[PDB]
């Protein structure tokens, strides 16, 4: 449901879902199923990639702050959510 997703998900995922879904012609008011699906699909893409970095030695690590800063690199790149091009 439009209000259910807009209540249970954050502005970034809402805006990203609102973007990515606007391509075929459908919209969250009529086609809620795919809006929520893409929203959740997005949320998982976030949760999967967030907080995960790689060390200079080459080791995999997780952290709280999530601001990279030189000594660490993001382990996963988030392809989904960006523009097709």
């Amino acid at each position: 449901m439009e209000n259910f997703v807009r209540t249970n998900f954050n502005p970034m995922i809402l805006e990203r879902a609102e973007k990515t879904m606007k391509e075929y012609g459908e919209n969250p008011q009529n086609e809620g199923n795919k809006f929520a699906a893409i929203s959740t699909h997005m949320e998982v893409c976030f949760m999967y990639s967030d907080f995960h970095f790689i060390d200079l030695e080459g080791n995999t690590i997780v952290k709280e702050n999530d601001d990279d800063n030189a000594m660490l690199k993001h382990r996963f790149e988030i392809i989904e959510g960006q523009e097709r091009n």
Binding site: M1, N8, V44, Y48, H52, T60, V62
Partner: protein, 83 residues
């Protein structure tokens, strides 16, 4: 899989219930995150419980203009179109 065969893309399949299935059951992501995801997806399933075409048409102003344009002995653009 029977669609992504050939290309060696990593497939990870989750579910709202809790079960899980990745490619060859070699889970690259650490356990705490994969658990947290399965928590979020569970909370979503709980919350969810406790909670083509192509068209084009004349608007009035232009429709009247269409009705105006056509030959004499005709009243409507729809009528002339039908004729």
């Amino acid at each position: 899989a029977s669609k992504l065969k050939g290309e060696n893309v990593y497939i990870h399949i989750f579910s709202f219930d809790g079960e899980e299935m990745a490619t060859d059951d070699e889970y690259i992501l650490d356990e705490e995150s994969r658990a947290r995801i399965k928590t979020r997806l569970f909370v979503l399933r709980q919350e969810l419980a406790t909670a083509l075409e192509e068209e084009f048409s004349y608007p009035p102003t232009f429709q009247r203009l269409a009705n105006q344009s056509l030959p004499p002995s005709f009243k409507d653009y729809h009528q002339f179109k039908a004729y």
